[PDB]
Amino acid sequence: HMFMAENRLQLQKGSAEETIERFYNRQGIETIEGFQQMFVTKTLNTEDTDEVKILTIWESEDSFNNWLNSDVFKEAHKNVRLKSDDDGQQSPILSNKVFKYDIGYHYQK
Amino acid sequence: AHMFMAENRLQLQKGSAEETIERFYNRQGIETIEGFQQMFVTKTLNTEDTDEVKILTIWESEDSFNNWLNSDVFKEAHKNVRLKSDDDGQQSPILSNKVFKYDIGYHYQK
Numbered sequence A: 001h002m003f004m005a006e007n008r009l010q011l012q013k014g015s016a017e018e019t020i021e022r023f024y025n026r027q028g029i030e031t032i033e034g035f036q037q038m039f040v041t042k043t044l045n046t047e048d049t050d051e052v053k054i055l056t057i058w059e060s061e062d063s064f065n066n067w068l069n070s071d072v073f074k075e076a077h078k079n080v081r082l083k084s085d086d087d088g089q090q091s092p093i094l095s096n097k098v099f100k101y102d103i104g105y106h107y108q109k
Numbered sequence B: 001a002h003m004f005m006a007e008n009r010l011q012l013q014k015g016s017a018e019e020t021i022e023r024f025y026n027r028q029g030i031e032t033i034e035g036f037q038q039m040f041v042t043k044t045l046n047t048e049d050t051d052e053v054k055i056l057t058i059w060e061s062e063d064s065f066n067n068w069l070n071s072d073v074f075k076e077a078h079k080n081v082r083l084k085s086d087d088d089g090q091q092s093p094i095l096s097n098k099v100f101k102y103d104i105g106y107h108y109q110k
C-alpha cells in the first residue's frame, strides 16, 4: 500500500494564497526514493483561520521518514517561521499538525 | 485553471476501516464523468476509538464534481449505502459523514 502524509497549516485569515505560492518550486523532496506525488490545497468555505494542506504520497511510510530525516527537508524549511517564533511576528502561519494515512485504494481514469 | 478536490470523511466503528475500503474497489460510474481524474481512499493512522476513512476525489473543476454529485451514477453508487443512524442501518458500521472541499493550488508528480 501507498502511504500519505499530510501537513495541515493553520493560517491567518486570507493568507492561504501567499502561503501556497511558497510551494511552487521543488527543494529536493523529489530526490527521495519512494516519493510519488504532492498536492497543496486550500480548504474552501473557511470562516475563521485559513487552512492549507500539504499532501505527500509515498510508496511507503519508510520513504516519508527518510525524507523527514534528510538534509533537503531541513533546507526546504530553514527560513520557515511560526508567528510565535521570536522573529516570526510577520508570519501568517499559526501552527501545523501532521496526519498520516494508509492508502487502501487508488484509481486513476 | 486549478484542479478541485472533494473529500467525504467517514467516521466508522472501530475495526471496520478495511471492510469499508473494499467497497470502493469496484467502479460504479464515476469514471464516466467528464472532468473526473483520480480517487484515493485512506485510513487514518491514530489511536482514536473510531476508525476514519476518507474518500478523496480529484477533478478538473468544481463544476465537474457538481455534475457528478447531481448525476444518476452518484445515486446508483449510493443506493444501498446506509448509516448506523438510518432505520435500516443495523448492519452499517458508518456512524457519520462530512464533506470537505478544496482548491488544488499546486500539484507535482515524480
Ligand code: HEM
Binding pocket: A005, A006, A007, A022, A023, A025, A026, A027, A028, A029, A030, A038, A054, A056, A072, A076, A077, A080, A081, A082, A093, A095, A096, A098
Ligand atoms: C514544522 C512545521 C512546518 C511548517 C510551519 C511548514 C511550512 C512550510 C513552508 C512555509 C514551506 C515552503 C517553504 C519556503 O517558503 O520555501 C514548506 C515546504 C514543504 N513542506 Fe513544510 N512545514 C512544516 C513541516 C512539514 C512537514 C512535517 C511536512 C510533511 C508532509 C511538510 C511538507 C512540506 C513539503 C512537501 C514542502 C516542499 C518541500 C520540497 O519541495 O522539497 N512540511 N513547509
Ligand code: HEM
Binding pocket: B006, B007, B008, B023, B024, B026, B027, B028, B029, B030, B031, B039, B055, B056, B057, B073, B077, B078, B080, B081, B082, B083, B094, B097, B099
Ligand atoms: C451521503 C453520505 C455518503 C456515504 C455514507 C457514503 C459512503 C459510501 C460507500 C459505503 C460507498 C461504496 C458503495 C458500495 O458499497 O457499493 C460509496 C461510494 C462512493 N462515494 Fe460515497 N458516501 C456518501 C456520499 C459521498 C460524497 C458526498 C462523495 C464525494 C466525495 C462520495 C464519494 C464516493 C465515491 C467517489 C464512491 C465510488 C463511486 C463510483 O465508483 O462510481 N460519497 N460511498
Ligand SMILES: [Mg+2]
Binding pocket: A014, A046
Ligand atoms: Mg476566505
